[PDB]
């Protein structure tokens, strides 16, 4: 009846398997091949692209998904290699139509994700990639013309920010140097139409942001143009030139035969993702410009300010730094090996793009110090030609100091002095003699003074006095000695003189807090008590930074007691400054320790910065360095408490009870931290508004000119608060608009708040 | 010099493995792995003879050095992928306890590799299977499969290794191990990957290949309807094992066979009986032959689903190996069937294709057919249609074939054919 | 990034750099000014036997110390090429050489 399977096998499946390949290893190898194509090779680029297209094609059956992944990534992460990868995709497309169609779908997909996650800067690379794929017979030009139509239509939405409209326009005009010719060849009537729309929009845009973002206000020798006005002139010059440009390298031109055989794909209609309350767009920009061909008469002719070559070159070099900024040797190497269709003065472009980055407003793309070490690496790499370009560039930045934005001037000062410290401080000071007979308050003599102060901080007083010509001695910094009020100046009649003597004797034999408190009771909130204590203590620790930190620590209890009140914190700072006014660096490090150990707080320091005692030094760099350092500590404190609260919640997913209570107490400390930060900004703005108003009202009443050196500095320091902390300050719109920067505010001051608003409007 | 780690001599591997510098070791280990995964004639014995296993086993534990765990895991996988002596060497190296430890690695590529190795080791047979289970391989393995979405490779590797813990007999896997494995198999049976499904079916087909207790643990799980659904899958790799499982299940009790009928098996059969893949035809008709050994009400469901004309076609037109199964199906049917059921079978044209196989060179099959004939004559007696059946058999040449069996070499065939001649073909 | 076992763990969370090849005359104040260019300094400890040609620099966050390893390391102060490395952390006694 019933029968088990016979020929008694269990089906004959393999009993064992030997591992003969590895998916990861293959995927890593593919990624390496894709990332490396275009690098130096014994074989030509074209040769390597055909080979690679062959290796990739043969791996499609098993790794297509991966290969697609890799090429999209290269598309958004390596824009400087654009035409290399579009060529590669073009080869794949010619061999495989489905792959191409599939790649294009993957690209539009990724584009939409980037846009939704507010990754607009990457999105532009993706868009440029789609554009160049038209040259590689992968995408039909009319479908590209059509997507750009929807882009420009963004200029049409109602109730959306200028920066949103702006981007879409930018991504479109941006692509034209790559695909301008093709799109205008196939659809010239319709391209003329979009240029009409686009143009009318540019004319309509507001330029409220421009003064906040220019590196120089002066129109000559080079205007610093708003980024879209400039790009539009470049495109318009490209159009007059029949869409011929002389720079971009296009490896696909060598595959004319293969690519003409292939079949194109159409892009689907594209709906720009609608603006939502959560969307964030790039800030507008002003094009940094300092060179023209006359600056390099011996070199190949420099492309003009209004050529698409200048735009592409600079774009690619910024992208090179973005890819390699963490590794300076590699970064320098990539910059110097940047290729092009025709010869260009590469050393001028590199130097110009680096300064474009360091001087960018609101902020450089990367930490300021990187630019210094990068330019040093480039000087070692190109020792025969790059240093002369950098010296020349320096002489040019100097000569144009007069309308340079304060924020940039600070960076120029910090860069130049740090650079010089790497080269024995060698510089031709007499070239800058013009500055010796100008008002000491004007930008040039001010810059020279601040530079020499910085150089002294990287060495020492006598060194600096020794390297400048005798005629610059007036601009040299003071000997950083401390001033002891109760020293050997026969002034026994000063109040607390004898208490100061007791204090000194007690410190020198090693005092305790209780002992110091005891002596201080003999003083007539007690300002005089603070004065004698601080004067004597700082004086006895004057030898070095760590002697001083040591004193602040040892007698921390006395500081915290004497400065419990707000007037106490203020008086400590005031007396500290009377002691160490000749030594700004010591002032900075002491203010830092006092805040970190709560002898004083951020509000006290803000008030102190704007106090009458600091008035003579108010336009000096060290003052603004201290203020910003104080703000940075407030900001970092808030972040730290936020981070701790986020991890307590994340960890919540007796042990429970204890954690919930800790969360509650953390939430309570965040609100307190955030309120302290808001106050600090509020105080800073209130003081700026009050002292700017005093100036403007006095000048207009008295019939004198508003625009003085003092004013240039004060208005731009206010500007500078907004530039460095805009993300934080945007949290305070309602308060600022209602209570500080109101409609009645003198327009000179209001304008700065408006310029700030114009960054994300 | 060598080029990187391609094609080192054993001697180089030995010197690099026996070095103080782990980077030397990591390169030698990789060199061994490349030798072991090469297309042609991996030198397994040479590597074993060079005393490398223990070192390889050490490396599995070098927690700190992620890369060398992987290269060694991959090496030992390829050694154990060979013959019984080669896998026993890996096992004697203490590799089992150490691969299980790796199942918990934070690096997915390493645990995945430990899964593959344990799979090769269990795949050797019942002893190493048991040996693997007893080291506690099961808990962690199943631990990896809780709450997709892992990578494909990874899932397939896990499923394949589980299917080896389910496989082989004498003895069958420990019952308790099976009961803990099964719930995972049930969920894997509902996954979407073709290869995971193929191997989950194999796994189940292994568990159902045993006595009524074993069959009943699979049945009680509720998987049969899903097995029956996979019989219709367009992928042959999945149909085959699903069909084998369903086939093993109906070798069980009538109640267990009822479960597969209840799940829709009979509606797929017409498709499997005419499947151009003859292995499928053969297995399906085998399966049917065990269904028709069931109760009269089950035979009736075979009838009501129109399966008989299909059995007659297979009896007539299929290759011999499939015809043998159909002979069994027909004879079981005639053995348990009611009179009306036999009548219908005769009406479907059973006699001729049945008598045609009396020339078979297979004496066992000849005895089964004569049994069927005897069964059908017993139905004929109750109906008084004995003569009509005789003439039916006579008219298609069936009597000539039964008489020829009088001179058959086999004594049983002679006795059974004589008995038929005597009772029904000797009119006075 | 190329400028950035139990010890391979410590270093990867460290915030302090050991700094060598310094001129014997380079001062704590100068180190403050140079090293602050990558972020805020918690403490500096000068190496002694008088001045010894090395120091420790401890930042408040790792990011700032990574930036010094990338951009201050390998530059030239008082004509000496500055050489920094990750340090497991200062311990008392380690400031003598």
From Swiss-Prot, chain A:
Q: Effect of altering residue 6 to A?
A: Reduced phosphorylation by RPS6KB1. Abolishes phosphorylation by RPS6KB1
Its GO CC terms are: cytoplasm; cytosol; mitochondrion; nuclear cap binding complex; nucleoplasm; nucleus; ribonucleoprotein complex; RNA cap binding complex
Phosphothreonine found at:
20
> PTM Phosphoserine: at which residues?
6, 21, 200
Q: Which residues carry this modification: N6-acetyllysine?
A: 203, 669
> What's noted about post-translational modification?
Dephosphorylated at Thr-20 by the PNUTS-PP1 complex during RNA polymerase II transcription pause-release.
Where's the Glycyl lysine isopeptide (Lys-Gly) (interchain with G-Cter in SUMO2) crosslink? 655
Which positions are tagged coiled coil?
Answer: 629-684
Which positions does the motif Nuclear localization signal occupy? 2-19
The subcellular location is: Nucleus; Cytoplasm
Disordered: annotated segments: 1-25
Q: Which GO terms describe its biological process?
A: 7-methylguanosine mRNA capping; alternative mRNA splicing, via spliceosome; cap-dependent translational initiation; defense response to virus; histone mRNA metabolic process; miRNA-mediated post-transcriptional gene silencing; mRNA 3'-end processing; mRNA export from nucleus
Domain MIF4G, which positions?
Answer: 27-239
Query: Is Phosphoprotein there in the keyword field?
Result: yes
Query: Keywords assigned by UniProt?
Result: Acetylation, Coiled coil, Cytoplasm, Isopeptide bond, mRNA capping, mRNA processing, mRNA splicing, mRNA transport, Nonsense-mediated mRNA decay, Nucleus, Phosphoprotein, RNA-mediated gene silencing, Translation regulation, Transport, Ubl conjugation
Under InterPro entries, the record lists: ARM-type_fold, CBP80, MIF4G-like_typ-1, MIF4G-like_typ-2, MIF4G-like_typ-3
Please name the GO terms that the record assigns under molecular function: molecular adaptor activity; mRNA binding; RNA 7-methylguanosine cap binding; RNA binding; RNA cap binding
Superkingdom to which the source organism belongs: Eukaryota
One Pfam short name: MIF4G
What does the UniProt function comment say about this protein? Answer: Component of the cap-binding complex (CBC), which binds cotranscriptionally to the 5'-cap of pre-mRNAs and is involved in various processes such as pre-mRNA splicing, translation regulation, nonsense-mediated mRNA decay, RNA-mediated gene silencing (RNAi) by microRNAs (miRNAs) and mRNA export. The CBC complex is involved in mRNA export from the nucleus via its interaction with ALYREF/THOC4/ALY, leading to the recruitment of the mRNA export machinery to the 5'-end of mRNA and to mRNA export in a 5' to 3' direction through the nuclear pore.
Q: Which organism is it from?
A: Homo sapiens
From Swiss-Prot, chain B:
**List of residues that carry Phosphoserine:** 419
Keyword annotations from UniProtKB, A to Z: Acetylation, Cytoplasm, Endoplasmic reticulum, Golgi apparatus, Host-virus interaction, Membrane, Nucleus, Phosphoprotein, Protein transport, Repeat, Transport, Ubl conjugation
Source organism superkingdom: Eukaryota
For this protein, what is any one GO molecular function term?
RNA binding
Region entry NLS binding site (major), spans: 74-167
Provide GO CC annotations from the record: cytoplasm; cytosol; endoplasmic reticulum membrane; Golgi membrane; host cell; membrane; NLS-dependent protein nuclear import complex; nuclear membrane
The tissues where this chain's protein is expressed are given as:
Expressed ubiquitously.
The reply on keyword Metal-binding is no
- Reproduce the UniProt comment on modification after translation: Ubiquitinated. Deubiquitinated by USP22; leading to stabilization and increased activity.
- Where does the UniProt annotation locate this protein? Cytoplasm; Nucleus; Endoplasmic reticulum membrane; Golgi apparatus membrane
ARM repeat intervals: 3-43, 44-83, 84-125, 132-173, 175-211, 212-251, 254-293, 296-338, 339-385, 386-425
Note down the stretches annotated as region NLS binding site (minor): 244-332
Family assignment? Belongs to the importin alpha family.
Q: What is known of its domains?
A: Consists of an N-terminal hydrophilic region, a hydrophobic central region composed of 10 repeats, and a short hydrophilic C-terminus. The N-terminal hydrophilic region contains the importin beta binding domain (IBB domain), which is sufficient for binding importin beta and essential for nuclear protein import.
Q: What is its quaternary makeup?
A: Heterodimer; with KPNB1. Interacts with ANP32E. Component of a complex containing CSE1L, RAN and KPNA2. Interacts directly with CSE1L. Interacts with PLAG1. Interacts with APEX1 (via N-terminus). Interacts with FRG1 (via N-terminus). Interacts with ARL4A, CTNNBL1 and NBN. Interacts with SNAI1 (via zinc fingers) and SNAI2 (via zinc fingers). Interacts with BAG6. Interacts with AIFM2; this interaction likely mediates the translocation of AIFM2 into the nucleus upon oxidative stress. Interacts with RSL1D1.
Name this polypeptide is given = Importin subunit alpha-1
Q: Which gene encodes it?
A: KPNA2
Shown part of the complete sequence:
70 to 499 of 529
From Swiss-Prot, chain C:
Listed A to Z, the keywords are: Acetylation, Cytoplasm, Methylation, mRNA processing, mRNA splicing, mRNA transport, Nonsense-mediated mRNA decay, Nucleus, Phosphoprotein, RNA-binding, RNA-mediated gene silencing, Translation regulation, Transport
- Per the record, what is the consequence of mutating residue 83 to A/T? Does not affect mRNA cap-binding
Q: What is the effect of changing residue 56 to A?
A: Impairs mRNA cap-binding
Coiled-coil spans in chain: none
Q: Which residues carry this modification: Phosphoserine?
A: 2
Q: What is the effect of changing residue 54 to A?
A: Abolishes mRNA cap-binding
Q: Where does mRNA bind?
A: 18, 83-87, 94-97
Q: Does the keyword DNA-binding apply?
A: no
What this protein is reported to do is described as: Component of the cap-binding complex (CBC), which binds co-transcriptionally to the 5' cap of pre-mRNAs and is involved in various processes such as pre-mRNA splicing, translation regulation, nonsense-mediated mRNA decay, RNA-mediated gene silencing (RNAi) by microRNAs (miRNAs) and mRNA export. The CBC complex is involved in mRNA export from the nucleus via its interaction with ALYREF/THOC4/ALY, leading to the recruitment of the mRNA export machinery to the 5' end of mRNA and to mRNA export in a 5' to 3' direction through the nuclear pore.
The entry's family comment says: Belongs to the RRM NCBP2 family.
Know the name of this protein?
Answer: Nuclear cap-binding protein subunit 2
The species this protein belongs to is Homo sapiens (Human)
- Name the gene for this chain: NCBP2
Please tell me where this chain falls within the complete protein, as first and last residue plus total length: 12 to 126 of 156
């Amino acid at each position: 009846s019933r029968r088990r399977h016979s020929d008694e096998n269990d089906g004959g499946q393999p009993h064992k398997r030997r591992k003969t390949s590895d998916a990861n290893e293959t995927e890593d190898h593919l990624e390496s091949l894709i990332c490396k194509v275009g690098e130096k090779s014994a074989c030509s680029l074209e040769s390597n692209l055909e080979g690679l297209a062959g290796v990739l094609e043969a791996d499609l059956p098993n790794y297509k998904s991966k290969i697609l992944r890799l090429l999209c990534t290269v598309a958004r992460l390596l824009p400087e290699k654009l035409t290399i990868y579009t060529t590669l995709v073009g080869l794949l497309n010619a061999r495989n139509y489905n792959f191409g169609g599939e790649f294009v779908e993957a690209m539009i997909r990724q584009l939409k994700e980037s846009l939704k996650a507010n990754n607009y800067n990457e999105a532009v690379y993706l868009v440029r990639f789609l554009s160049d794929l038209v040259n590689c017979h992968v995408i039909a030009a009319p479908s590209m013309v059509a997507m750009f139509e929807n882009f420009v239509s963004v200029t049409q939405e109602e109730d959306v920010p200028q920066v949103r409209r702006d981007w879409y326009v930018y991504a479109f005009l941006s692509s034209l140097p790559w695909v301008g010719k093709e799109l205008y060849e196939k659809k010239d009537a319709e391209m003329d139409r979009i240029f009409a729309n686009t143009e009318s929009y540019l004319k309509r845009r507001q330029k409220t942001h421009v003064p906040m973002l220019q590196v120089w206000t002066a129109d000559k020798p080079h205007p610093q143009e708003e980024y879209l006005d400039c790009l539009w002139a470049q495109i318009q010059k490209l159009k007059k030139d029949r869409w011929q440009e002389r720079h971009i390298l296009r490896p696909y031109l060598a595959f004319d035969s293969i690519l003409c055989e292939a079949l194109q794909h159409n892009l689907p209609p594209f709906t720009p993702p609608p603006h939502t309350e959560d969307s964030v767009y790039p800030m507008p920009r002003v094009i940094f410009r300092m060179f023209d061909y006359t600056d390099d008469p011996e070199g190949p002719v420099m492309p003009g300010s209004h050529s698409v070559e200048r735009f592409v070159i600079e774009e690619n070099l910024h992208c090179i730094i973005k890819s390699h900024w963490k590794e300076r040797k590699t970064c320098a190497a990539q910059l110097v090996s940047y290729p092009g269709k025709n010869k260009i003065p590469l050393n001028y472009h590199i130097v110009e793009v680096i300064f474009a980055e360091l001087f960018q407003l609101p902020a450089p793309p990367h930490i300021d110090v990187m630019y210094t070490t990068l330019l040093i690496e480039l000087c070692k790499l190109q020792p025969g030609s790059l240093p002369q370009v950098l010296a020349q560039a320096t002489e040019m930045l100097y000569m144009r100091l007069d309308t340079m934005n304060t924020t940039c001037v600070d960076r120029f000062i910090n860069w130049f002095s740090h650079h010089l410290s790497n080269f024995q401080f060698r510089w031709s000071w007499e070239d800058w003699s013009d500055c010796l007979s100008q008002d000491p308050e004007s930008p040039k003599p001010k810059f020279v003074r601040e530079v020499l102060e910085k150089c002294m901080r990287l060495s020492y007083h006598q060194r600096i006095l020794d390297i400048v010509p005798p005629t610059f001695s007036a601009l040299c910094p003071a000997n950083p000695t401390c001033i002891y009020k109760y020293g050997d100046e026969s002034s026994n009649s000063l109040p607390g003189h004898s208490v100061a003597l007791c204090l000194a004797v007690a410190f020198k034999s090693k005092a305790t807090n209780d002992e110091i408190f005891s002596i201080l009771k003999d003083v007539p909130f007690n300002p005089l008590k603070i004065e004698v204590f601080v004067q004597t203590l700082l004086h006895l620790a004057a030898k070095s930074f760590s002697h001083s930190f040591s004193a602040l620590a040892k007698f921390h209890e006395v500081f915290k007691t004497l400065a419990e009140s707000d007037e106490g914190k203020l008086h400590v700072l005031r007396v500290m400054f009377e002691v160490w006014r000749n030594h700004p660096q010591m002032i900075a490090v002491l203010v830092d320790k006092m805040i970190r150990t709560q002898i004083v707080d951020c509000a006290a320091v803000a008030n102190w910065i704007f106090s009458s005692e600091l008035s003579r030094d108010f336009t000096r760099l060290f003052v603004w360095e201290i203020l910003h350092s104080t703000i940075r500590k407030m900001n970092k404190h808030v972040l730290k408490i936020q981070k701790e609260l986020e991890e307590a919640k994340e960890k919540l997913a007796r042990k429970d009870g204890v954690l919930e209570e800790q969360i509650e107490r953390l939430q309570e400390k965040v609100e307190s931290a955030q309120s302290e930060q808001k106050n600090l900004f509020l105080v800073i703005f209130q003081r700026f508004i009050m002292i700017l108003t005093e100036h403007l009202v006095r000048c207009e009443t008295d019939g004198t000119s508003v625009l003085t050196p003092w004013y240039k500095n004060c208005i731009e320091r206010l500007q500078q608060i907004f530039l460095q902390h805009h993300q934080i300050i945007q949290q305070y719109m309602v308060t600022l608009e209602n209570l500080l920067f109101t409609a009645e505010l003198d327009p000179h001051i209001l304008a700065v708040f408006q310029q700030f608003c114009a960054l994300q409007a | 010099m060598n080029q990187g780690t391609v094609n080192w001599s054993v001697d180089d591997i030995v010197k690099g493995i026996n070095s103080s510098n782990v980077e030397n070791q990591l390169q030698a280990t990789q060199a061994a792995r490349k030798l072991l995964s090469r297309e042609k004639q991996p030198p397994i014995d040479n590597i074993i003879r060079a005393g490398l296993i223990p070192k390889f086993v050490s490396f599995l534990g070098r927690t700190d050095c992620s890369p060398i765990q992987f290269e060694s895991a991959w090496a030992l996988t390829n050694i154990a992928s060979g013959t019984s002596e080669q896998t026993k060497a890996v096992v004697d190296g203490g590799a089992i306890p150490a691969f299980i430890s790796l199942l918990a690695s934070p690096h997915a590529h390493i645990s995945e590799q430990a899964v593959w190795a344990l799979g090769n080791i269990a795949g050797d047979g019942s002893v190493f299977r048991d040996l693997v289970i007893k080291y506690g391989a099961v808990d962690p393995l199943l631990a990896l499969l809780a709450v997709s979405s892992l990578a494909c490779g990874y899932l397939r590797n896990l499923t394949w290794t589980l299917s080896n813990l389910c496989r082989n007999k004498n003895p069958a896997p420990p019952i308790d191990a099976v009961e803990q494995i099964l719930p995972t198999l049930v969920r894997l049976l509902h996954h979407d990957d073709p290869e995971v499904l193929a191997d989950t079916c194999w796994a189940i087909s292994y568990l159902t290949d045993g006595p009524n207790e074993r069959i009943g643990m699979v049945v009680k799980t509720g998987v049969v309807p899903q097995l029956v659904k996979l019989l219709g899958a367009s992928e042959l790799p999945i149909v085959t094992p699903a069909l084998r499982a369903i086939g093993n299940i109906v070798t069980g009790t009538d109640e267990q066979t009822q479960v597969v009928i209840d799940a829709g098996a009979l509606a797929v059969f017409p498709s499997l009986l005419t499947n151009p893949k003859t292995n499928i035809q053969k297995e399906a008709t085998w399966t049917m032959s065990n269904i028709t050994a069931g109760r009269q009400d089950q035979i009736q469901q075979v009838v009501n689903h129109g399966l008989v004309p299909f059995l007659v076609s297979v009896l007539s037109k299929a290759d011999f190996k499939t015809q043998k199964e159909a002979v069994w199906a027909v004879t079981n049917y005639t053995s348990g069937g009611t009179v009306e059921q036999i009548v219908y079978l005769v009406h479907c044209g059973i006699i001729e294709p049945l008598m045609n196989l009396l020339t078979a060179k297979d004496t066992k099959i000849i005895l089964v057919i004569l049994d069927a004939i005897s069964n059908i004559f017993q139905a004929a007696e109750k109906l008084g249609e004995t003569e009509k059946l005789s003439i039916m058999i006579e008219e298609c040449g069936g009597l000539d074939k039964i008489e020829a069996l009088q001179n058959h070499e086999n004594e049983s065939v002679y006795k059974a054919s004589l008995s038929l001649i005597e009772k029904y073909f000797s009119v006075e | 990034d190329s400028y950035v076992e139990e010890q391979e763990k410590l270093l990867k969370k460290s915030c302090t750099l050991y700094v060598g090849n310094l001129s014997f005359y380079t001062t704590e104040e100068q180190i403050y000014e140079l090293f602050s260019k990558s972020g805020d300094i918690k403490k500096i400890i000068m190496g002694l036997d008088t001045a010894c040609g090395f120091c420790f620099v401890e930042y408040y966050s790792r990011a700032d110390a990574e930036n010094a390893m990338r951009y201050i390391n390998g530059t030239r102060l008082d004509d000496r090429i500055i050489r920094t490395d990750w340090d497991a952390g200062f311990k008392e006694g380690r400031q003598y050489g």
